Amino acid sequence: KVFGRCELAAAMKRHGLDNYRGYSLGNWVCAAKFESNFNTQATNRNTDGSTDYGILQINSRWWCNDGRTPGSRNLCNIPCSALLSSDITASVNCAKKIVSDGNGMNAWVAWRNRCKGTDVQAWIRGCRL
């Protein structure tokens, strides 16, 4: 599924990401934009051989099992394919674990390089939330 911007904002709010660990909703929308272009089916291979999955590009090195990432953990205890669903529940629940792991949203490279330090409220402007 390719989400609309406000559609995704509302789904993320319903799932409790607004101000989760202090990160306002616009941070999460901004991250999703630059990670996946709001597309739940997005996949991208990393240099290390791991793959990133879904709307928040969650990595198979640490977080999900894709059967082809040696020496990898599965700390969200999920198959990586579950992160491609039109239902973002698995992605959100796994993201809550990631952001709680010590480095906040710096775990998402695109957030650090494209969203951090910017006016992230712009990403939810206009949305009925």
**Residue 101 annotated as binding?**
yes
23 close to 105: Cβ distance less than 8 angstroms? yes
**Rounded to an integer, what distance in angstroms lies between the CA atom of residue 3 and that of residue 101?**
27
- Determine contact, residues 29/39, Cβ cutoff 8 Å: no
22 or 71: CB nearest Na ion: 71
Sole window of 42-50, 51-59, 60-68, 107-115 interacting with Cl ion (rule: CB under 5 A):
60-68
How many residues bind to Na ion according to rule CB under 5 A? 5
Q: Is 27 or 60 the residue whose CB approaches Na ion more closely? A: 60
Nearest approach, Cβ of residue 50 and Na ion (Å): 7
Does the active-site annotation cover 66? no
From residue 7 to residue 46, the character string flagging contacts with Cl ion as x (rule: CB under 5 A) and all else as - is: x---x------------xxx--------------------
To Cl ion, the closest distance from the beta carbon of 110 in angstroms equals: 14
Query: Does the annotation mark 119 as catalytic?
Result: no
For 46, residues 6+ apart whose C-beta sits below 8 A from its C-beta are: 52, 59, 61
In the complex, which residues of this chain contact Na ion (CB under 5 A)?
A: 60, 65, 69, 72, 74
List active site positions. 35, 52
Binding residues for substrate: 101
